[PDB]
Amino acid sequence: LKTAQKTLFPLRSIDDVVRLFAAELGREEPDLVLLSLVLGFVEHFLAVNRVGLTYFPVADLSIIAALYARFTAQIRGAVDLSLYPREGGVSSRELVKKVSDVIWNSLSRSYFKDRAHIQSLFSFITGTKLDSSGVAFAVVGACQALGLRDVHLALSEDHAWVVFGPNGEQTAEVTWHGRGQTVNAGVAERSWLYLKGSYMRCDRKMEVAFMVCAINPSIDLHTDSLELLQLQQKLLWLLYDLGHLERYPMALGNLADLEELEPTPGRPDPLTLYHKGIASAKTYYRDEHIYPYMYLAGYHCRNRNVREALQAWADTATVIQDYNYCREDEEIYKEFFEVANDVIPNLLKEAASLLSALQDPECFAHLLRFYDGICKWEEGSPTPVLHVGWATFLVQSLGRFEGQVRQKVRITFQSEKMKGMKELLVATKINSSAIKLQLTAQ
Amino acid sequence: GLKTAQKTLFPLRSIDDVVRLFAAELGREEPDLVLLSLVLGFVEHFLAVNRVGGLTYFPVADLSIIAALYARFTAQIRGAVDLSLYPREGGVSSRELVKKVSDVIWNSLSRSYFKDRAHIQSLFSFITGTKLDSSGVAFAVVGACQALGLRDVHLALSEDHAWVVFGPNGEQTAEVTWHGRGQTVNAGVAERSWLYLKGSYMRCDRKMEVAFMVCAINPSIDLHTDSLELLQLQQKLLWLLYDLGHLERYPMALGNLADLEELEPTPGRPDPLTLYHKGIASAKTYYRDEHIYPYMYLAGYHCRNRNVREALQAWADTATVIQDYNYCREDEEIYKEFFEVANDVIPNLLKEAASLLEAGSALQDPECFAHLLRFYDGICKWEEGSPTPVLHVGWATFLVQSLGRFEGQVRQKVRITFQSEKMKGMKELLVATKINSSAIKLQLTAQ
Ligand SMILES: CCN(C(=O)c1cc(F)ccc1Oc1cncnc1N1CC2(CCN(C[C@H]3CC[C@H](NS(=O)(=O)CC)CC3)CC2)C1)C(C)C
Ligand SMILES: CCN(C(=O)c1cc(F)ccc1Oc1cncnc1N1CC2(CCN(C[C@H]3CC[C@H](NS(=O)(=O)CC)CC3)CC2)C1)C(C)C
Numbered sequence: 001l002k003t004a005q006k007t008l009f010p011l012r013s014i015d016d017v018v019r020l021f022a023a024e025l026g027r028e029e030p031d032l033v034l035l036s037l038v039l040g041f042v043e044h045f046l047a048v049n050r051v052g053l054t055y056f057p058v059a060d061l062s063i064i065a066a067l068y069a070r071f072t073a074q075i076r077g078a079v080d081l082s083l084y085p086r087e088g089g090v091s092s093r094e095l096v097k098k099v100s101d102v103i104w105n106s107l108s109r110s111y112f113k114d115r116a117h118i119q120s121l122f123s124f125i126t127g128t129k130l131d132s133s134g135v136a137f138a139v140v141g142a143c144q145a146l147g148l149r150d151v152h153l154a155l156s157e158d159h160a161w162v163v164f165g166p167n168g169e170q171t172a173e174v175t176w177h178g179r180g181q182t183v184n185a186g187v188a189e190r191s192w193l194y195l196k197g198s199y200m201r202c203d204r205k206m207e208v209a210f211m212v213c214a215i216n217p218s219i220d221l222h223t224d225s226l227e228l229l230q231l232q233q234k235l236l237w238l239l240y241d242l243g244h245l246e247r248y249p250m251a252l253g254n255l256a257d258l259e260e261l262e263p264t265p266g267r268p269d270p271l272t273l274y275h276k277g278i279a280s281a282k283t284y285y286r287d288e289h290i291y292p293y294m295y296l297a298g299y300h301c302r303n304r305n306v307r308e309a310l311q312a313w314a315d316t317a318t319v320i321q322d323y324n325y326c327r328e329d330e331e332i333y334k335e336f337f338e339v340a341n342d343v344i345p346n347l348l349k350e351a352a353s354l355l356s357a358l359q360d361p362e363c364f365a366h367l368l369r370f371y372d373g374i375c376k377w378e379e380g381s382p383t384p385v386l387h388v389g390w391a392t393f394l395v396q397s398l399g400r401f402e403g404q405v406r407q408k409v410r411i412t413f414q415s416e417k418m419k420g421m422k423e424l425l426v427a428t429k430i431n432s433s434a435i436k437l438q439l440t441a442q
Numbered sequence: 443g444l445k446t447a448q449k450t451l452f453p454l455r456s457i458d459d460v461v462r463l464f465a466a467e468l469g470r471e472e473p474d475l476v477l478l479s480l481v482l483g484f485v486e487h488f489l490a491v492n493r494v495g496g497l498t499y500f501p502v503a504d505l506s507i508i509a510a511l512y513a514r515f516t517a518q519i520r521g522a523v524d525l526s527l528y529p530r531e532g533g534v535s536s537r538e539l540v541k542k543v544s545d546v547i548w549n550s551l552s553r554s555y556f557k558d559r560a561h562i563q564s565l566f567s568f569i570t571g572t573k574l575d576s577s578g579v580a581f582a583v584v585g586a587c588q589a590l591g592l593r594d595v596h597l598a599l600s601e602d603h604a605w606v607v608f609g610p611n612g613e614q615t616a617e618v619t620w621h622g623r624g625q626t627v628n629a630g631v632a633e634r635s636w637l638y639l640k641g642s643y644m645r646c647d648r649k650m651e652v653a654f655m656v657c658a659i660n661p662s663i664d665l666h667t668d669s670l671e672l673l674q675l676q677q678k679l680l681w682l683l684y685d686l687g688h689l690e691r692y693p694m695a696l697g698n699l700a701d702l703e704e705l706e707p708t709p710g711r712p713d714p715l716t717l718y719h720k721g722i723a724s725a726k727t728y729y730r731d732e733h734i735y736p737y738m739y740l741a742g743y744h745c746r747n748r749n750v751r752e753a754l755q756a757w758a759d760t761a762t763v764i765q766d767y768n769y770c771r772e773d774e775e776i777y778k779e780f781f782e783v784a785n786d787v788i789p790n791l792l793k794e795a796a797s798l799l800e801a802g803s804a805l806q807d808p809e810c811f812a813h814l815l816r817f818y819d820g821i822c823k824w825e826e827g828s829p830t831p832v833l834h835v836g837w838a839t840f841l842v843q844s845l846g847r848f849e850g851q852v853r854q855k856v857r858i859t860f861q862s863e864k865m866k867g868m869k870e871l872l873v874a875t876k877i878n879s880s881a882i883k884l885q886l887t888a889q
């Protein structure tokens with residue numbers, strides 16, 4: 001650590017942490033290892049080993065300098081750079097593989113790899129435990145501590161790896177999902193997990209944004225750390241103000257969800273931030289991201305804006321339609337399954353009871369765009385998506401709209417399945433049996 | 443269908459009115475299972491499913507609502523099942539007749555729903571929603587059978603499944619619902635899976651069937667909130683059944699009542715520890731000590747009160763029961779309960795204890811170390827002869843971590859009976875002053 005950094009200690013409050021982040025983000029190379037260990041330390045004494053009162057666990061220089069030394073010396077100890085000629089200020093694959101192996105070999109052979117609060121370098125140093133994405137982050141933190149300035153975090157919506165080399169052009173798998181390979185076959189197979197190449201390639205500032213989104217305020221299934229929520233919210237505003245969330249759609253979604261919980265006066269309202277996330281995905285990631293729409297959909301859902309919610313879910317299906325469903329895409333499958341088979345059916349039932357969205361042919365058209373996207377998603381997929389469970393809720397959901405509301409609705413149907421049954425969907429009588437068979441055809 | 447006697451207990455305006463109805467029905471040779479299910483169903487629905495500085499409330503059940511629902515259930519069954527086609531010699535039901543009632547219930551359900559959802563356990567949910575969970579179906583078949591006058595059809599339950607017994611002396615069994623047929627449960631008993639308790643399952647009379655529907659009350663509103671009123675209702679109904687002697691052969695019901703007494707103790711009542719012990723005594727006396735949950739119930743209570751010795755003793759008891767079973771695919775519930783104990787609760791309890799020890803005690807007690815070894819030995823013996831492994835490398839790490847919470851001086855002299863070849867195979871390593879982590883790991887995970 002430099003004298004500059006040392007003077008920001010001890011961290012006695014949330015404002016002290018925000019000052020340390022502000023100071024580090026001002027530099028060309030923010031110290032990822034310092035910042036990770038500090039969030040790790042604060043998360044550990046607020047979520048994992050707690051103590052009414054709200055409190056901040058004071059981070060003395062003595063504790064954080066020790067942890068920093070432990071991480072940096074461990075990496076430097078394990079990697080002899082004089083064996084890796086590093087011509088043109090670019091790292092070789094052999095060097096990135098080696099740092100990957102150093103991180104891998106330092107982990108416990110057996111732990112709950114899915115547990116909360118094993119995301120930070122704190123958990124790696126004090127516990128020898130990292131989650132999936134904790135590993136990729138640790139490889140990048142190690143690379144920075146070795147002075148390898150071209151090694152960066154790549155993320156999809158559910159996986160992480162590294163890019164390196166002349167233009168961030170090279171990719172390497174470093175962690176497990178659900179090594180040393182490129183991600184090219186993932187991009188080529190058009191799975192959601194690799195976003196068809198439209199994944200985030202972070203600079204050091206997005207890597208700080210990632211570790212801030214990684215803060216997990218969960219204490220148990222019933223209780224969040226208020227202090228960790230407050231810390232995340234202030235750190236995300238700092239990154240917002242400095243321009244570092246511009247190319248981070250999920251971070252704007254995260255900050256919007258926090259603003260819905262506890263609005264910051266003078267700040268953009270949640271709807272603005274959800275739209276900025278969607279604008280970010282459209283502008284920088286070829287509109288290939290699902291969560292910015294799912295975020296907006298959740299907010300409208302929670303506020304009982306049924307039209308707006310169904311519109312946002314139809315958008316999510318309009319994105320997913322250009323993918324193939326592959327084995328490792330199960331997170332987004334479950335999110336679509338929850339929307340189709342639980343949230344929409346319940347929202348429509350709420351509406352039917354108050355009766356409205358059910359007299360609005362616009363809401364019916366959103367529902368059809370939703371199912372059409374899902375059917376087009378399934379086309380060309382190496383595994384089916386729609387089984388008989390889906391079919392029931394389709395018919396149930398269609399039937400919440402009277403013949404007069406459904407009759408004139410005309411949308412573009414990308415999918416062969418919805419094309420195949422356009423006459424059944426606008427018919428005065430819903431032929432439930434035929435719709436069911438058509439949807440589950442395979 | 444309903445008698446003047448029953449009609450005069452209406453409307454139900456309070457929890458006490460519901461207790462009066464149950465009291466009146468339990469006084470009879472044939473308590474009306476369909477009436478009682480519809481009433482709990484109705485009350486659950488307006489307290490947990492469709493709710494209203496705050497209010498607690500009781501949803502008034504008018505005769506008009508309950509008599510309608512009763513008629514709907516009983517007429518629907520009588521409509522579907524023509525008894526004159528099933529000659530019923532000796533006052534005993536045929537398999538074809540039980541299978542038919544099973545098919546009627548199955549055919550009445552929505553073709554797709556979340557069969558795993560809360561609040562789809564009652565005949566209320568079946569009549570108003572055409573939705574039943576697994577055990578809701580078995581109960582519905584028995585309620586249908588009673589409304590058809592089939593006096594020999596009774597609810598059978600294990601700790602995670604339900605079917606029916608019928609015939610001369612409850613001789614016959616039929617699968618009626620899904621887990622996770624018209625076939626017997628004989629192959630389940632023979633495979634020695636926990637799901638069929640090796641034949642030591644509950645064969646309910648009509649009073650235990652009321653107890654089952656009372657245990658079926660689900661007070662959950664969402665993940666974070668219980669209906670106070672439904673907890674209060676369940677507790678008073680369980681006391682009624684207790685006082686009348688109907689919980690004597692229902693170990694999980696005494697566990698349920700004990701959990702409620704810990705939440706809100708009833709003055710003048712036996713304390714929770716008494717009720718958990720009654721549950722265990724019931725399992726030992728009437729079920730060949732083949733039940734796991736009476737011990738798990740006791741273990742949870744000790745755990746929540748930070749009686750570490752007593753908790754580890756109760757968990758070691760649970761492993762002493764399971765050791766005489768084979769782990770089969772559909773026993774996943776109890777697997778997960780053992781996994782949670784071994785790999786989460788015990789490690790965390792021991793870590794708590796280690797911290798209170800460095801600060802200025804179960805960890806200096808060789809009795810607690812012995813309990814831990816009995817636990818692992820039962821689990822290894824459970825695995826022996828199983829068609830599925832139980833122990834993988836995840837288990838091994840927490841064993842070593844948990845052994846290591848006890849110093850060499852505490853572990854050294856402990857000698858327990860080892861049923862499993864696996865624990866016998868490494869008895870010297872467990873009491874050694876140095877824990878050979880690597881060897882212990884391989885021994886427990888091998889095969
Ligand atoms: C959240 C933790 N996390 C990851 O999960 C992650 C790891 C990776 F390797 C790659 C991507 C990752 O995701 C994120 C990355 N950066 C920031 N945020 C990430 N998140 C937030 C995320 C998506 C959104 N969901 C919340 C939504 C889900 C859909 C929901 N809509 S709905 O209710 O209509 C659907 C039922 C609204 C809330 C939480 C998890 C994943 C990172 C930060 C370590
Ligand atoms: C919802 C309850 N229910 C069933 O789940 C059920 C269905 C069947 F087909 C067959 C048996 C069934 O179980 C019960 C039947 N009758 C009454 N109670 C039943 N219960 C209570 C039961 C077991 C105990 N658990 C709670 C315990 C679990 C162990 C725990 N101990 S621990 O914390 O030390 C273990 C980590 C204490 C709380 C709740 C569910 C299953 C019936 C009443 C419909």
Ligand SMILES: [Mg+2]
Nearest residue numbers: 157158159331
């Ligand atoms: Mg994920």
Ligand SMILES: [Mg+2]
Nearest residue numbers: 287318319322
């Ligand atoms: Mg697209």
Ligand SMILES: [Mg+2]
Nearest residue numbers: 601602603775
């Ligand atoms: Mg169960």
Ligand SMILES: [Mg+2]
Nearest residue numbers: 731762763766
């Ligand atoms: Mg035994």
